[PDB]
Symmetry: C4
Subunit: 380 residues, 4 copies
Amino acid sequence: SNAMWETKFAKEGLTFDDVLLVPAKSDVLPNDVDLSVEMAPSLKLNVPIWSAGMDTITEAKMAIAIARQGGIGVVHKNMSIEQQAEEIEKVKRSESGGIKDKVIEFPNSAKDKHGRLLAAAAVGITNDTFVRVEKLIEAGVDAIVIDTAHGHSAGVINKISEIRQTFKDVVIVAGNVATAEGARALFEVGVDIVKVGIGPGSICTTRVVAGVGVPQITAIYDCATVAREFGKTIIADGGIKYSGDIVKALAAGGNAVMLGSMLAGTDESPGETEIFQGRQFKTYRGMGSLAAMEHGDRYFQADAKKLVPEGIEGRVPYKGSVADIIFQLVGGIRSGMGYTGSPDLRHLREEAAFVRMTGAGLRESHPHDIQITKEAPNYS
Amino acid sequence: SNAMWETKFAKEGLTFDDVLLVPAKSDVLPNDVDLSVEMAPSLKLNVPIWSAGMDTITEAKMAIAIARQGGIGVVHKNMSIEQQAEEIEKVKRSESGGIKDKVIEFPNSAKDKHGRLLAAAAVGITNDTFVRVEKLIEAGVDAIVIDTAHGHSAGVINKISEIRQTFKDVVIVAGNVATAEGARALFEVGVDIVKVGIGPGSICTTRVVAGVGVPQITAIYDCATVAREFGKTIIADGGIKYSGDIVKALAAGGNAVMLGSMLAGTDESPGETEIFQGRQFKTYRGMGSLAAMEHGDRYFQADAKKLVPEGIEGRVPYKGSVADIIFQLVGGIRSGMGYTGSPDLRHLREEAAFVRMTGAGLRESHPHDIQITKEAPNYS
Amino acid sequence: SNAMWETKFAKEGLTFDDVLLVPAKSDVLPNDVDLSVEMAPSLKLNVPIWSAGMDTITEAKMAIAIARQGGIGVVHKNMSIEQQAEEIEKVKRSESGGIKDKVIEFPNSAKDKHGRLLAAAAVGITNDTFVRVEKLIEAGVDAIVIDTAHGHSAGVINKISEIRQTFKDVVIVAGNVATAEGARALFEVGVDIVKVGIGPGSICTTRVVAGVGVPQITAIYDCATVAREFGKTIIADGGIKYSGDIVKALAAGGNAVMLGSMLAGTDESPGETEIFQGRQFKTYRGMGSLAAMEHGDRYFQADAKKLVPEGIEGRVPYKGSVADIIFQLVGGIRSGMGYTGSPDLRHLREEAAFVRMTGAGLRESHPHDIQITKEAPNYS
Amino acid sequence: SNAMWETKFAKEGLTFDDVLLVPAKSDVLPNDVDLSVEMAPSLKLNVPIWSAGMDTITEAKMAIAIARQGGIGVVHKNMSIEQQAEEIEKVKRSESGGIKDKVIEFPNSAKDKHGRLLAAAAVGITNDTFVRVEKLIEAGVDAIVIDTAHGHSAGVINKISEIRQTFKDVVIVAGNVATAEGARALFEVGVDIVKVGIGPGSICTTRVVAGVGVPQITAIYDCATVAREFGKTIIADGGIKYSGDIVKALAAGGNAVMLGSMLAGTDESPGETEIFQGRQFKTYRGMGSLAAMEHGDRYFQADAKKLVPEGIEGRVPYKGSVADIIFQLVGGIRSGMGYTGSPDLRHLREEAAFVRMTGAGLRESHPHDIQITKEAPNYS
Ligand SMILES: O=c1[nH]c(=O)c2[nH+]cn([C@@H]3O[C@H](COP(=O)(O)O)[C@@H](O)[C@H]3O)c2[nH]1
Ligand SMILES: O=c1[nH]c(=O)c2[nH+]cn([C@@H]3O[C@H](COP(=O)(O)O)[C@@H](O)[C@H]3O)c2[nH]1
Ligand SMILES: O=c1[nH]c(=O)c2[nH+]cn([C@@H]3O[C@H](COP(=O)(O)O)[C@@H](O)[C@H]3O)c2[nH]1
Ligand SMILES: O=c1[nH]c(=O)c2[nH+]cn([C@@H]3O[C@H](COP(=O)(O)O)[C@@H](O)[C@H]3O)c2[nH]1
């Protein structure tokens, strides 16, 4: 391993705050760009956003809200198989075109071939994963999300291969990985969508507790290079703080992004708001935090207990409705695509160029040297 | 686009706080350097400063004040065509040599061929842009500023070409761009002066909301390279916080700079001062903030509404008169030209050299390890 | 020295916060990885951790606690030879398998060939170093730690050679060094284990007072390269703040780490807790601080007094028991080895790869943009 | 100037916080290293320290105190020629070996060939510079310091050449410069000692107001390269915050350093202490601040008034005596020379090597993650 010894520090990594997209000749206005993305032949989104499979982010109510805005929700797995199946049934029974009380239309709703809202569901690697997958498919789930901390592991890959073999037609998302070799290993066993991100999440301590990770722009770019070879897709999962980071994640190769923090504290996230000193907040916590792993309500098999936590528990200010949050994100995405001359997301992924910057460039990019007197809806 | 794919992260960008000017052999004292600049055959400034075309920076009163100090003001377009024409008439009727009450002389006033103070005016891309340009020219405007967020866009370039074709002699400023190709596209349709800057403004959130921009020293240098080929000029617009940044912007290739924040809160900026807890302040806000776009007084056509804001609203401490602010900026410019051995701005643009530095170099450059006991007039 | 003149600034250095470990294909779960390390033929640890030889970190009580968890303690030398010999006798008489009051077992205890807890002891370079070493060996010490600020010095190397010559079988740790040439100079006189680190300690001011040091990841990597050539080992000493830094230190080539700050404020560190404003704390101080050097209780020879201090005196929040702290560190190490696919520490040292990152990458690695509401046991 | 255009951003610059000295094999203990330096054949210091020629740093009382510790003071020029001559006479009449009340010896005093304390004096470029130089020489001054903001200027070089021509034997210090070409231009007209530094001072705003400067480690190294060719010396002037920065400045090529901030607030600096909220402080201000330039006591010719200030006015905590401050600095220098294996300053300048580091390396170098409970005498 003298070869590995001499190359220990060769690789370099970039994150969102290291880069900007370069403006380019543009023939398309922001309101005319196409935000649609085909994640798999049977799974098309109208906005490139997945809500995170976390017990403070996505149950039925969030999955309904985000699918009606054109995305898709991943119902978390910290519940019994029967409970998670019923959450999916709630999504598939929900109104997808519009509701009255006076007329709220959902013209951009992401739907299956039968006009029902799309919905996804997380599963782990446990003895009962096949049963959970079976009951989710029977409930009408549109994608299974094999959600693991280290997707590039023999045990995970073997479990996916067995799932792919028994359930030949379900769309399989699997993750997380952060390297080309990890993405390739998953696509080679039949994964449809690879989820990218080790450590970048707002609530996570993986990089500090284990010392492991890849800066997220590099992780996306390295994994998207492999996805292009297979003709498949990736989800850029974690570390997105502003709408501009979504544009960066997609331009680096992401077909869609997954959001935790930016959707935390919305009306449709699980739990209720709590008033503290005249201010509204909601809980947001890592799925590897102590509170999230100490779940024990009805019985379910959980992933093998980790010795020490890899997330923290926190609270976020109340944000409002999912519809209003998505409206702000979409406006930012459309603005960025207009600046880069991208009429659709394929052009953004394939053609856009970045410029690297220092911490001084970052300070120039935010507002600077001004006393802000009102919070902007997209800059809180 | 495998070529674009492999070069996604090739480009690097520098901003003001990344660089310093290197001192050089100097035969000229600061008081003897020449700060004049010809922006176009009919538009000569005595100090290389344009005031920003913003509704909290420049109306008639600011345009008069800054032209009397040797610069030029861009009257903003958030008003009716008739109102904006009358603002220009106020500037062109104002005294340009001196006034009494006891004798205030303006020996460095920038004037047209008839001895009237110079004045510029912003226009957008709307159906009535030709009428606005016509009435501004009839009012005696010295330059039209085609003010757009993304100047490198087919719609903007087509509108400029049509304007250039109907009004063959007016000086046209157009922007904003941040790349060589964007500058070239504008000069090729007859723009006289290209305005450079995407995202660096103090009050702006473009880089964070859309993910797009270029660090401003690189943007200036890339665009000035093209201006040199055409024998035309550029305005370095945005991100200047100190007089030393003006010297940097000009040495990077800028023929002149445009200032928002450094002129905000002056007596001549629009609005009145407001006392808050014994301290004086004035409002300063992005033209892409909610308050600035929600203007609706007399009717006018506005640029197409953007879905989400790209600026914030803020307040700045009262600064004093435009004359005293310009005096401090000019003293800093003259000092920098003396250090670089530049007898005039052409030598500064063409000959001066920079040295790149880290964040540690930046901390050494400011005052450090001292409890400042009085604010300096040029270091507040 | 024109050769030295032209290469003054050639070398570059990395520390923990500059790098992350890259995840790799993994066939081993965290609970099955092997944390054992042979530091020398007669000195095997079950977890790769040495407690620092400091008078606020390690006396008999800490050495017992950490050996029972699988590591080894270095009893400090700021005491008489007789006192330090008695501390070692206390360790070697202590129960190593388990104790009652109800049954506390120590299944991972690091023991000598007679079933007694391992223990090490610091010595200096003074006239009586041979006598101190003799009495420590008679007490049953398992390793002597020649503890000096600048191990790459003629006086230190000559003293070690004389010790190695009189005491032919004792395990000798010597330090500190930070360069390949310094490590080589010590291994060449018979040192068994080289201790690496000049300036990285939490409580130390060496780099700021003397201007001297090497960023600690580079120091480890440079010295481990030499250790590999000799077939010997190194201790990565100083600058570790989180369990993830331990994984980084070992992957950079360290066979084991030495901890001060992460063990300060434990029940078993010397001194008692002091309540200040309802909060518990303990003292932690550099061995080069004024208070630590002004020791004058029973008489002992001290290293030559330094003119000015090179450490500070501080206080740390109470941490709890050594057992609970080690449990958190080990969980983090096991998680990192699982992510890197390392079944044992040899694979981590020899095979793991890093990715370099900016300050923006570091901010993404920690929790960001969240109001943490409870402290994590491994993220305080 | 297409050659200058393409090389605008080629040069890179380092400051103190960017680098560390690498430890090396050492045969010399800190107490045995030689801190002497010959600045010129008739000017030898016993510690390599000049006190700054500033009206809040050096008059007779500071010049006496620092010469008795082995350095030399530069009496500032913000006073009449007669007054400045009398300050020098006070220094040359002062006791240099020792004083009683009980016996204070000054065994390291820097003295002239007649046993009188060394002393230097600042002069400017004015019409009466020849008269000031004449009266200072008649008073027995050991060096004249031509103190200008931009030493690489025709007017300064012409004035120095005329001085060198009339006063053929006085030691001439001249500055400030920051480039090889500026140093060469001064040595070529007969300057004995070149003073290096544009912008790094604690109290100065030159880099922010004018945009001009060179990071100080690079400035020293570039200028020392020229000094080596001429067989002459340089003073590293400005930006030194800790004793470790002195070691860095000398290892980068400086023969001696000049200190402002580290000597401000001492008993011997001009002015008295002022109690503010139970705490002692003294004034410290740039010679380019408004208060320092608005001096108008007895009449003197001042350098041409600059339009705008290039320094600020501040206050520093009381530090104690010059003797105690120098003792701490010398201890740090001796420690660094011991670590680098430098028996004298020539070896430090010629042989020592640096390692470059990031901001993460800097945070590791200072104390980190500790609540300091007492201020160290060399780390306040
Ligand atoms: O290392 C981790 N420890 C955790 O406890 C944890 N919880 C969530 N996640 C991941 O973070 C993503 C959400 O990130 P953001 O809040 O930044 O959008 C999610 O989509 C997950 O990928 C975790 N990662
Ligand atoms: O992205 C933007 N969103 C906005 O809302 C906005 N408002 C002003 N500007 C631009 O900023 C310039 C002034 O910048 P400074 O205050 O830094 O001088 C101005 O001259 C404009 O170029 C904006 N840019
Ligand atoms: O330069 C120094 N001056 C000091 O006063 C000092 N005291 C301890 N040490 C060293 O720091 C190590 C502990 O570092 P941490 O607290 O970061 O674990 C220890 O293991 C030592 O190597 C010192 N280094
Ligand atoms: O640009 C400047 N504007 C000023 O007003 C000023 N005053 C002092 N100096 C220079 O700073 C040096 C002292 O620096 P320190 O306090 O960092 O030691 C001094 O030795 C001078 O070289 C100035 N430089």
